[model samples]
Target: NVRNGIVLNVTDTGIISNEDTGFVTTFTQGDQIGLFAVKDGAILDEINNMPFTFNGSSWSGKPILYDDRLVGVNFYAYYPYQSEMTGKTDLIGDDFFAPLAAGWELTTEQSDQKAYAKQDLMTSNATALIGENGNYSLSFQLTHRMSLVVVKLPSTRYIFTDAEGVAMPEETPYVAMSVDVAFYLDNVEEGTKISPYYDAKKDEYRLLRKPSSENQIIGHYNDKQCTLDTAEKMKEGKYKRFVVDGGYKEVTHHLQVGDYYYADGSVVSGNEAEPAKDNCIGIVCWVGNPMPSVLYKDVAGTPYTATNDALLRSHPNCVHGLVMSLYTETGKFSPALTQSIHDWFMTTSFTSSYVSVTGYYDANENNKNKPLRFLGYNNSEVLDLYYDTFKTDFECFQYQDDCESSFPSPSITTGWYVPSSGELVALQDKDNSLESKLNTKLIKVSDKTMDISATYWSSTERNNKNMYIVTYSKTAGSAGTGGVKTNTYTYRFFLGF
Candidate 1:
């Protein structure tokens, strides 16, 4: 509304101009006063947590484009989001915090600290906001204005004691963690000041550290956020918290395999392992804690060898997707296959998904080695092994004792079922990350002879009652076993499916 005898027009880029009067003004994209031109190949809208592309006619979530080229640019509006931690200063105090605490990850946010990476919506790298019910959610644009916004779902419930000594669900339905992160462009400093919210009603940014009464900031993003002020910052590095007796243990413990000893040297535990078939590696598994851990060794308590019989011994490092030897955990592995306990371990939720716990006797008996054990595609063989190991003698749900007959049906059983798809995804994710971390080249374990060939079985099966196996082959190019005989490889061991 400025000028003496002059009027102007605005474009999506907020640029002002005079059409009939033939007036043009210059401005940059970074400035609020500039008229953002809809050029060919300009990003009209960028999002995270979604997959979409504008086709001139409409926005398509699924776009099939052959190449990246210039299409006439389109105009769009951007809703402002937090660009820094200014608003969270009181909630997190004077601590340096990352988006995720420990169990959480930065899937999508309006803003992020410099310590990690962000994924724009509509891209494969975009994070899927997983819900507590094991469903992945997709977030949409918010209509109203608010200080901070987050789309999160809970997992594995636990009991918590209140200050008054009242026990309640760890994540109280309405009172669970409600935190807001700052926002920024591709380039922004951790300490830089930026808007924390877009007052949709005001059509502007809110730069105040103190949020409005109705729209107030709460606590840190995660437990680690609050601990930043502690003498030692929790997020400084990885902290391994192993499980003992299928429970948790500290990092200082020792990994005992027969007469040999492996030191639990890493300060990182409580994460899941990945699946053997995927050949994925490392901490890239699902998020959170109470996950199972394992140490694989030979049946005779000796170091595992490519040729010898290897067994995954469960002393309880983490329990999520945990599988064990038939004789070790279940008195009779085969008969227990008819029971549900075996199924529970394989199919249940875990901190990390099915990580390939490469059964190796580290030079000194510590640290998982690269180049896995056996190599081959033996999903069937591995499934048998999984059942052979996890299947325990028939026992009542109340006790872990042996039973003469088959256990009750899974429906009536308290704990037993195949791992869900979500669990499987987690397993693969972690497997991939771990593979990168170890930098070990793993041959695809399929049903054939390769330089490194081994068969691994998961407690998972295609059907509810069948077994699922994963094969790894060190050889170069072999897809399946000969003669269509599933009985080609017999000496394969399995982790909990």
Candidate 2:
């Protein structure tokens, strides 16, 4: 029997945005999440649709408890918690949930941050464990449940109405900052007038739309339905833009990013953002977090199995790794070396430092006991003897026939090792996806969130003196920087499981 209060660390996917800069984001104070606790595959009565508020520093509310008696705690949460949900039926996977919660709707007047966030609609399904301190702490990665459409006009210059009520379609040249518009899907909307929020800097109007709806086609039209040329099913968290320059009419043509509208209301395949293009009106691309199907909270606190090629799917006996790879074909990065890596350390006496060997084996950049290893050393003896030792310190005794053999490749000994440069860099995409998915949560085993800006050790060496290093930097990224093997860098331990 065990009891402890739950601590939460939540990261938002698309709560608030800065519009023009390199994506200004973070949760504002007073933000809330509707949290649900599932124990043994059922919803916990005490925490179902519970409101948890952020106090700018951390989340505060009734303390949720976890019992070590169960496998672990499963948490499902949503951003901007609603009060109406508190009175609704509480079931684990019933009709009343994030995707279809109580009366939640996108605010049509999203001209400000708070109102904008209300429409963002993000959700999460995560799990946590009793930490080293014996408390349940969870990290929630909220995924956006809506899509964003940024509509750019050919020019801000347009005709306007005057207080005098002049009706001549005259040269009433004036700067128009805002305009009223209609939203169309499969259903016609006479019920609401969407006054899209306009961004002066980008010369665009932004509107929020459901990622999925009855209508497979969506676009701006002067008529009933959208043209085939502009129709596209939305990808959750995807960003698209429409340039209203040509005839706004319905037609049958396939429109792509560079295609521009034409006089007949059909699209012409041009307007690309390149040197040949004189002035490009618009282009669509992606930036925000995709809906996460598998996240760390799903795999954190379970038993580790040796043959983990099964990936993040459910298994009867062992838990999967914390990090899910982009492709999922190659593999994922494991949780802390402890819960699993703990058993992989070659020697029990091996501290971050070993003695001559022992001053303080700084794992910083901050691992509690980060190892300093050279690429070519042979095992616990000279390495702790040098333990700037990675090379031979892991050398297999099985390879030493007369012991006249090198202990390296297909070792009789195998399990954790630093990931290769290529494998490690894949996690460092431009979106800073790794940090977005995991930096807010503590690695269940180590009780530490990953360092977003720290440099990491990679197993691939570029030369005898230089080895690849993966700095979790936005600018440097995984752009192949190598360092001398003698220098100390933090290493993330990886295993098949």
Candidate 3:
């Protein structure tokens, strides 16, 4: 009985790398690759979906022995390893065209390397033959399936100076400022805005783009930002870089907190009259880690919302936290005759274990308990709910109104929900700068001002029968305004970048 085995190894020094790099190209300990093997020909006759894990130095997995000494094995492996190939593990073509859900992000690593890794899709193929000692050494080299762009720049405020260090027009050498920027890459498809992975240490921005036939690569760094749509062969697994090699004007993106996020998807300074696009979505309340799942709710009574109306679950243009849309027939968040709707937006009672609980939110203290810790309500505000219950219950279940929708998973109509209890309390920071700035824009864009003192409904419910209504400046404690879930109240719709 002649028997020899295949030895597997994942080798790529200093992996250009992710879920986990200007890019992560390396495999870590416990990283597995879904592998398939063929004995005689391209037809997969033997192993299927076998996992070969990285153990720092070498890859280890169950052995694939050779039935014949002369015959070798053909192997295929893919990243974001799957336990089992869904449809046909028995076929080579099945794994050849295996679909990867494409929804890569630039900002918000989701607090882990894997979230960065998850966005990347990679593959490897190798054919092994018998070695010196009756062994088949199978080495796999992971290959990226998308093109990459790297941006390295410093916000340098250049002042023209003469050769003698004399100020030209009294201009000095240069002034460097700490400029903040959120990078955006425009895809040919749907004008979809793509964010960048800000490698703060590298002080760089990197975007892994899908190859386009009519390749046009553009980069926009907030206001005073820069970009160029150039035609270049954007082949997969390639690198393109952007840098400020010489003296230049520093650029700052205007998509900062308190900026008006317009309907056309440009975050600009002030609510001033911009020609053409004037429709306002909302003001940016917060900007940090991206919302785990972006969605909002509509009030049937408000002009901004109504029954059977759908909203964008996750729009790249929307700021990290979308202030609720209060646009009315007259203007945005008008104080005049209101059309606040009744009902808790639900008929019965239910429990959403996912959302951060009702209470005052402290940004630093309570980050632990929140489903998304970035929200900062660890204890009182345990977690924030966005499609946790999803289409399972009243929030969006009955009509599947705002059910679970992913960027890749053909978004459905029902991706909106009322602000969580803490989501509302977060708005009540005694320092009212956010409100003052937002009011001016609403007026200019839609002639509306958010009425802070007015009673508003919250999506948080106490027990099964009572839902919380938020209003006023009481930051702490239960502002005991538990209206019956059956009662009517006005609600607002919101989203996050």
Candidate 4:
């Protein structure tokens, strides 16, 4: 039924009675390729070509260019002719299985075995491939192409590391990089492409103050010329600093503890390249207060209509930050249920997080992918865990879509909030390793109690009024601030969707 290496051609139609797979050759229609349904045991009629020529229906869409190659295709609905368009193809639907499974396999004559080329059939119109071959998985094919390239990515693996130095390969976290090295801009057309004047007297890169003013100095990074601010918030059209290695290299030299910057591009720095120490990028989390009755539950590949008592009753809500601890009036609940939540969180994707634990390999950037690391029972002060869903600290953990089309606003109660360390330890003492404690593995933050040395985070702040840093000291069995807001702590949590 399956022919591994046969060429399907228009001339060979109906020649083969059964399914045929193609070899590395030929671009003609006659070439024997992936299994195709044929009428009369021959190529006389293609059962699958539906909608191809008769309806002119195809999976391929309007061809779009990526660099120089035709990368994006749009598929129109099946119509006998151009004017007879019947219905549009389900781009967001699950119809692209055949093309994807057939894969982006290449032909021998198509490659010189020198330069890399895309495997044409890689992208099918099927939505099922979204997780494996869609935009999130672009790096998979990109890396495969790079492997066939004359040069390879710099990293042994093409994955990126999180702020915690943990790498998750295959989880291509969405990243948008600027085209210019001198100045960062999300879109190229809108920004001033010309390099700005570097003031020797000021020891900083300076830009023209106004669009037309000869004497005005422009201070805003997004205000130079054609650039627009893509970030969520901008005050008086001022851009916020996103911490990164290259950004550090760009502006570190001009920064001092008390230095001031103009709304335009004027700043006073001593040098262009100054020593940068004590400059570790810290993680900041907003841990709100707790709510008693609200439970934030996530869908574990289940329909919304489906619900169990465990999901509806006792799920703790993590509104913005990670969840630190959960206790019922009845005491610690079931370990099996807690572990189920933990495992579910581990598998689900989070914002700014990639799909695979291993990171992706990027040929364009010459970086290899990094796989997610479990760390496996380490004794550090911080326990890094992944959380899958989020809800607010309200009376009942229920999802209510915000009226605003864009932003998510999950309502919550002020008193019910994410717990801080001081609270966690208090609960720990009252319910310290109690067998009645849910009989769950959730109590033990670290797997190996003997080697446990680190404290983890709770969603609550140090106190009710303050904004951040509600930590739980696993060792001390109390809740309080763990580190400075400038530091990054690890915890599992759920919050407003």
Residues 1-497 of candidate 3 have per-residue lDDT tens digits of 12566677664322232201434466678777777766665545346677777788776777767556335656667776766466533344544534542332334232245665665667765546546656566676767776666666644533322335443331122233223344444443334455566664455666656655243444443234556442364456665665644423543343345666543234456545662233445565554323333222221322211221122222322223344453322111111112121122222232222223332232222322221222222111221232243222333122112211211111111123455555655555555653665555566555556666665555443433555555655332123345555554555544444
Which candidate should be chosen as best, given TM-score against the real structure? 3
What's the TM for model 4?
Answer: 0.19
Whichever of 1 and 3 has more lDDT, that candidate is 3
Query: Each candidate: what lDDT?
Result: 0.23, 0.42, 0.45, 0.23
Off by over 4 Å in 2: 1-5, 14-25, 69-71, 86-104, 154-192, 200-203, 214-230, 244-497
Error of 4 at 152 (Å): 21
Query: Higher lDDT: candidate 2 or 3?
Result: 3
TM-score of each: 0.19, 0.36, 0.39, 0.19
RMSD of each: 23.7, 26.0, 14.8, 22.8
After TM-score superposition, the amount by which residue 293's alpha carbon in candidate 4 deviates from its true location, in angstroms, is 28
For candidate 1, write residues 256-318 as lDDT tens digits.
Answer: 111110011111222223323321111212222221211244323444332322222221222
Candidate 4 global CA lDDT score:
0.23
Q: Write the per-residue lDDT of candidate 2 for residues 396-452, one digit (tens) a residue.
A: 222122111211111111222344453455555676645653332223212344466
- Highest lDDT against the true fold, candidate: 3
Over 1-497, each residue of candidate 4 has an lDDT whose tens digit, in order, gives 12221111111111111114211212222111122222222221222333222112222222221221112322211111122212322224455233332222332222221111222221222111112122221111100110110101011111223335454232222121211124422334335333433322222332211111112111233223323232332221122222222331222121221121111112222122331211101111222212211221232332111122211123223222222112221111111122222233334443112111111221111111111111111101011233213322221121111111111112221112223332334333233331223123222222212112334434322222221222223323533333332233433222210
Q: What TM-score quantifies how close candidate 2 is to the native fold?
A: 0.36
